[PDB]
Design a protein around this motif. Structure first.
Motif, PDB file in Angstrom:
ATOM      1  N   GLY A  15      47.050   5.386  -0.340  1.00  0.00           N
ATOM      2  CA  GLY A  15      48.269   5.218   0.423  1.00  0.00           C
ATOM      3  C   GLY A  15      48.675   6.515   1.091  1.00  0.00           C
ATOM      4  N   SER A  16      49.813   6.453   1.788  1.00  0.00           N
ATOM      5  CA  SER A  16      50.353   7.633   2.470  1.00  0.00           C
ATOM      6  C   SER A  16      51.868   7.433   2.584  1.00  0.00           C
ATOM      7  CB  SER A  16      49.691   7.833   3.826  1.00  0.00           C
ATOM      8  OG  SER A  16      49.797   9.187   4.258  1.00  0.00           O
ATOM      9  N   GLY A  17      52.600   7.972   1.610  1.00  0.00           N
ATOM     10  CA  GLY A  17      54.035   7.771   1.545  1.00  0.00           C
ATOM     11  C   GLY A  17      54.892   8.491   2.574  1.00  0.00           C
ATOM     12  N   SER A  18      56.098   8.886   2.159  1.00  0.00           N
ATOM     13  CA  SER A  18      57.024   9.630   3.005  1.00  0.00           C
ATOM     14  C   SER A  18      56.477  10.943   3.579  1.00  0.00           C
ATOM     15  CB  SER A  18      58.332   9.874   2.229  1.00  0.00           C
ATOM     16  OG  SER A  18      58.169  10.806   1.174  1.00  0.00           O
ATOM     17  N   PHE A  19      56.135  11.923   2.741  1.00  0.00           N
ATOM     18  CA  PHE A  19      55.633  13.215   3.225  1.00  0.00           C
ATOM     19  C   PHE A  19      54.471  13.654   2.352  1.00  0.00           C
ATOM     20  N   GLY A  20      53.275  13.206   2.719  1.00  0.00           N
ATOM     21  CA  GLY A  20      52.096  13.529   1.954  1.00  0.00           C
ATOM     22  C   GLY A  20      51.155  12.347   1.875  1.00  0.00           C
ATOM     23  N   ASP A  21      50.022  12.552   1.224  1.00  0.00           N
ATOM     24  CA  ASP A  21      49.058  11.496   0.981  1.00  0.00           C
ATOM     25  C   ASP A  21      49.003  11.246  -0.519  1.00  0.00           C
ATOM     26  OD1 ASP A  21      47.378  10.340   3.342  1.00  0.00           O
ATOM     27  OD2 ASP A  21      47.476  12.487   3.818  1.00  0.00           O
ATOM     28  N   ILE A  22      48.702  10.007  -0.895  1.00  0.00           N
ATOM     29  CA  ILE A  22      48.615   9.633  -2.302  1.00  0.00           C
ATOM     30  C   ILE A  22      47.220   9.126  -2.652  1.00  0.00           C
ATOM     31  CG2 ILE A  22      49.487   8.119  -4.112  1.00  0.00           C
ATOM     32  CD1 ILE A  22      51.928   8.107  -1.607  1.00  0.00           C
ATOM     33  N   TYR A  23      46.612   9.734  -3.666  1.00  0.00           N
ATOM     34  CA  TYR A  23      45.276   9.346  -4.102  1.00  0.00           C
ATOM     35  C   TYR A  23      45.276   8.920  -5.566  1.00  0.00           C
ATOM     36  CZ  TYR A  23      44.462  12.232   0.034  1.00  0.00           C
ATOM     37  OH  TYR A  23      44.518  12.788   1.292  1.00  0.00           O
ATOM     38  N   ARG A 126      67.571   5.944   0.421  1.00  0.00           N
ATOM     39  CA  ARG A 126      67.452   5.915   1.875  1.00  0.00           C
ATOM     40  C   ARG A 126      66.110   5.373   2.373  1.00  0.00           C
ATOM     41  NH1 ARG A 126      69.678  11.262   4.711  1.00  0.00           N
ATOM     42  NH2 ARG A 126      67.716  12.138   3.941  1.00  0.00           N
ATOM     43  N   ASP A 127      65.269   4.803   1.516  1.00  0.00           N
ATOM     44  CA  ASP A 127      64.021   4.220   2.012  1.00  0.00           C
ATOM     45  C   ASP A 127      63.699   2.949   1.229  1.00  0.00           C
ATOM     46  OD1 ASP A 127      61.877   4.239   3.895  1.00  0.00           O
ATOM     47  OD2 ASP A 127      60.524   5.177   2.437  1.00  0.00           O
ATOM     48  N   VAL A 128      64.714   2.112   1.046  1.00  0.00           N
ATOM     49  CA  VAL A 128      64.552   0.856   0.316  1.00  0.00           C
ATOM     50  C   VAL A 128      63.685  -0.088   1.146  1.00  0.00           C
ATOM     51  CG1 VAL A 128      65.763  -1.058  -0.764  1.00  0.00           C
ATOM     52  CG2 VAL A 128      66.746   1.217  -0.823  1.00  0.00           C
ATOM     53  N   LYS A 129      62.576  -0.540   0.575  1.00  0.00           N
ATOM     54  CA  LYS A 129      61.615  -1.398   1.266  1.00  0.00           C
ATOM     55  C   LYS A 129      60.612  -1.913   0.239  1.00  0.00           C
ATOM     56  CE  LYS A 129      58.635   2.451   2.894  1.00  0.00           C
ATOM     57  NZ  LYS A 129      58.022   3.104   4.104  1.00  0.00           N
ATOM     58  N   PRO A 130      59.952  -3.059   0.518  1.00  0.00           N
ATOM     59  CA  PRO A 130      59.002  -3.636  -0.468  1.00  0.00           C
ATOM     60  C   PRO A 130      57.997  -2.640  -1.008  1.00  0.00           C
ATOM     61  CG  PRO A 130      59.200  -5.100   1.430  1.00  0.00           C
ATOM     62  CD  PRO A 130      60.060  -3.883   1.738  1.00  0.00           C
ATOM     63  N   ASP A 131      57.472  -1.753  -0.156  1.00  0.00           N
ATOM     64  CA  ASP A 131      56.495  -0.761  -0.608  1.00  0.00           C
ATOM     65  C   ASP A 131      57.047   0.156  -1.689  1.00  0.00           C
ATOM     66  OD1 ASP A 131      54.297  -1.366   1.322  1.00  0.00           O
ATOM     67  OD2 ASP A 131      55.723  -0.611   2.815  1.00  0.00           O
ATOM     68  N   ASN A 132      58.365   0.354  -1.751  1.00  0.00           N
ATOM     69  CA  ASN A 132      58.920   1.334  -2.678  1.00  0.00           C
ATOM     70  C   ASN A 132      59.429   0.710  -3.963  1.00  0.00           C
ATOM     71  OD1 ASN A 132      58.209   3.359  -0.945  1.00  0.00           O
ATOM     72  ND2 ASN A 132      60.254   3.510   0.037  1.00  0.00           N
ATOM     73  N   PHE A 149      60.990   9.241  -3.651  1.00  0.00           N
ATOM     74  CA  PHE A 149      62.255   9.921  -3.466  1.00  0.00           C
ATOM     75  C   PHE A 149      62.155  11.008  -2.409  1.00  0.00           C
ATOM     76  CE2 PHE A 149      62.779   8.031  -7.683  1.00  0.00           C
ATOM     77  CZ  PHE A 149      64.056   7.480  -7.556  1.00  0.00           C
ATOM     78  N   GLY A 150      61.143  10.922  -1.537  1.00  0.00           N
ATOM     79  CA  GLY A 150      60.928  11.945  -0.529  1.00  0.00           C
ATOM     80  C   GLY A 150      62.012  11.980   0.523  1.00  0.00           C
ATOM     81  N   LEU A 151      62.663  10.847   0.761  1.00  0.00           N
ATOM     82  CA  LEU A 151      63.815  10.766   1.643  1.00  0.00           C
ATOM     83  C   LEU A 151      65.140  10.732   0.878  1.00  0.00           C
ATOM     84  CD1 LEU A 151      62.633   8.081   4.259  1.00  0.00           C
ATOM     85  CD2 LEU A 151      62.760  10.529   4.624  1.00  0.00           C
ATOM     86  N   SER A 292      47.015 -13.537  18.789  1.00  0.00           N
ATOM     87  CA  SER A 292      47.044 -12.962  17.442  1.00  0.00           C
ATOM     88  C   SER A 292      48.446 -13.042  16.779  1.00  0.00           C
ATOM     89  CB  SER A 292      46.517 -11.515  17.486  1.00  0.00           C
ATOM     90  OG  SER A 292      46.924 -10.828  18.659  1.00  0.00           O
ATOM     91  N   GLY A 293      48.630 -12.344  15.653  1.00  0.00           N
ATOM     92  CA  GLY A 293      49.853 -12.407  14.891  1.00  0.00           C
ATOM     93  C   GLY A 293      50.656 -11.119  14.908  1.00  0.00           C
ATOM     94  N   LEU A 294      51.481 -10.947  13.871  1.00  0.00           N
ATOM     95  CA  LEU A 294      52.381  -9.802  13.755  1.00  0.00           C
ATOM     96  C   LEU A 294      51.704  -8.627  13.057  1.00  0.00           C
ATOM     97  N   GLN A 295      51.732  -7.468  13.707  1.00  0.00           N
ATOM     98  CA  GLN A 295      51.254  -6.230  13.103  1.00  0.00           C
ATOM     99  C   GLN A 295      52.330  -5.132  13.108  1.00  0.00           C
ATOM    100  N   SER A 296      53.466  -5.366  12.454  1.00  0.00           N
ATOM    101  CA  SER A 296      54.548  -4.391  12.568  1.00  0.00           C
ATOM    102  C   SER A 296      54.357  -3.083  11.793  1.00  0.00           C
ATOM    103  CB  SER A 296      55.882  -4.967  12.143  1.00  0.00           C
ATOM    104  OG  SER A 296      56.697  -3.814  12.003  1.00  0.00           O
ATOM    105  N   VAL A 297      55.073  -2.051  12.243  1.00  0.00           N
ATOM    106  CA  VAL A 297      54.927  -0.689  11.724  1.00  0.00           C
ATOM    107  C   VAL A 297      56.252  -0.070  11.272  1.00  0.00           C
ATOM    108  N   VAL A 298      56.245   0.456  10.042  1.00  0.00           N
ATOM    109  CA  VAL A 298      57.436   1.032   9.418  1.00  0.00           C
ATOM    110  C   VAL A 298      57.798   2.432   9.919  1.00  0.00           C
ATOM    111  CG1 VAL A 298      57.059  -0.296   7.296  1.00  0.00           C
ATOM    112  CG2 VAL A 298      56.066   1.989   7.546  1.00  0.00           C
ATOM    113  N   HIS A 299      56.903   3.123  10.636  1.00  0.00           N
ATOM    114  CA  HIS A 299      57.156   4.506  11.034  1.00  0.00           C
ATOM    115  C   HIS A 299      57.419   4.691  12.523  1.00  0.00           C
ATOM    116  N   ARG A 300      57.132   3.689  13.349  1.00  0.00           N
ATOM    117  CA  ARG A 300      57.353   3.787  14.789  1.00  0.00           C
ATOM    118  C   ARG A 300      58.834   3.851  15.145  1.00  0.00           C
TER     119      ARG A 300
END
Lengths: 300, 299
Positions: A15-23, A126-132, A149-151, A292-300
């Motif tokens: 994954g790749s969260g708020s500020f950084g990469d996660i392995y 400040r970043d409530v969303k299914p991913d979190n 808690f990066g935000l 095609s379908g929906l490809q929405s983006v959380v960072h745009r």
């Protein structure tokens, strides 16, 4: 072998969260799988250290992941966390983006409590969303954890409880799909915004998508202004059409909190529970995924 | 508890590949972490069963991940693999998108050999890219694995070794950034094209990017045509400027192979092996790490 702290074998990027990469990391000592967040040491605006201190402050909490190791290693600041289960977004996709009403209500009750716990420790997420939100493992598989808690930011003084000041002309920090309208309007975030975002998360579970998601805009950044206009031109009663009125009452309550109001979390829980009982639901911790379908983006 | 095959605990999503998803798993019996590929049964263009069948054919192979379980559960077909380490793309980012020459040569040697093993099993990979190479774990931590056979295809008859027939006007299957030029031109893929792609991977490790990567196109039919146009208009001697001639010699050799030629893998490896020797690197297997937007084809 490649290690962090000479303790955790580094695995693939997960994954790749708020500020950084996660392995994915493997505790060499215990064998337990861990999550490993990395942040480059010259990130202009470093944050992993601040996030780690937030995590350390929340440690006792129900559904708060344990931080195992902090440190610096080479080109990176390192934060090793307990690995949890799939995210609510992950489970949503698994169940073909349809949750039953009971699974939504089971989740609502824990997520409200999670946000209240964070607020009780003087922080807003400040970043409530299914991913979190992630489910726990094995015996903790019925427990909803909150992550990232990066935000996060202190909303009140720990000693005096003086609230941070009201402010306008802010830019969005979090995810556009779930941001509160006051966030869209540029207003400083506070407790109500975590909860209003949850309200959009729950309607997103009910519907499979939200009406401002996948808005067919080509140019980016202007994409942001179009979400805000759809969000503002869609009444909560229209957003919530076809679902128990409690979901609209929840959203109206969150929009009605004043900037520094303490949310009535007990009310918001009761608003759902009561509906839970009216459906004849038992609290048996049986979620949809236990059976095609929906490809929405959380960072745009 | 949510399980797959009544044996594997489902974890978080760690990616997507060819056409399906994958979430970290845990074998309930052993505790060992696994990788779990999921593909919706309501798919019209399914491959997981065909992919898993290729995996079963390769099982003995060096650097070929083991299938543990394969089956159906609810709305999904399931393939459980051995979980391996980070991808070469993951390690590249970790090392800040800079690999030393010694690490490139270490990777090149194993990567040629992986592709040759696949070819020897009568298959072409057709999606050669950093993301589809993973390092092993622990004692096999210096071993480069090749993964993801969703785009693999038989190129020669198993019994007779008759090469599949030449064909034109095919659509692009893999990832535009690493596709052979002949793939861009619509020509049926064969052994040469896997190796040409590897050559682009190697120069990509050396450079940090490829000159056709991140091309600033808005539409999409266009962005691929501009990748194709940039790739074809960059002579190999310009792509490889500043690096040992072996990288251009490898790429020119791959571009020169005829459709059904058997590659001289031994030569391509030796070319890098002789370069390794003249650099005076120690033979220690030490890699660097042990010391509507733009679409470029994520699938």
């Amino acid at each position: 072998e490649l290690r962090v702290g000479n303790r955790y074998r580094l695995g693939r990027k997960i994954g790749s969260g708020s500020f950084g990469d996660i392995y994915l990391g493997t505790d060499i000592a215990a064998g337990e799988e861990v999550a490993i967040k990395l942040e480059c040491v010259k990130t202009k605006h470093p944050q992993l250290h601040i996030e780690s201190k937030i995590y350390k402050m929340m440690q006792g909490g129900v559904g708060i992941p344990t931080i195992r190791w902090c440190g610096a290693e080479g080109d990176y600041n390192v934060m090793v966390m307990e690995l949890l289960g799939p995210s609510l977004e992950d489970l949503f996709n698994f169940c073909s983006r349809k949750f039953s009403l009971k699974t939504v209500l089971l989740l609502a009750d824990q997520m409200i409590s999670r946000i209240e716990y964070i607020h009780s420790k003087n922080f807003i997420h400040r970043d409530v969303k299914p991913d979190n939100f992630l489910m726990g493992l094995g015996k903790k598989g019925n427990l909803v954890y909150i992550i990232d808690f990066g935000l996060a930011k202190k909303y009140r003084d720990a000693r005096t409880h003086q609230h941070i000041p009201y402010r306008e002309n802010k830019n969005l920090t979090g995810t556009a799909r779930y941001a509160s309208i006051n966030t869209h309007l540029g207003i400083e975030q506070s407790r109500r915004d975590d909860l209003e975002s949850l309200g959009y998360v729950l309607m997103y579970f009910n519907l499979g998508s939200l009406p401002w998601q996948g808005l067919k805009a080509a140019t980016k950044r202007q994409k942001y202004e179009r979400i805000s206009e759809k969000k503002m031109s869609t009444p909560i009663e229209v957003l919530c059409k076809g679902y128990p009125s409690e979901f609209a009452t929840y959203l109206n309550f969150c929009r009605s909190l004043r900037f520094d109001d303490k949310p009535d979390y007990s009310y918001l829980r009761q608003l759902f529970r009561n509906l839970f009982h009216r459906q004849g639901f038992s609290y048996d911790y049986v979620f949809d995924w236990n059976m095609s379908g929906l490809q929405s983006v959380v960072h745009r």
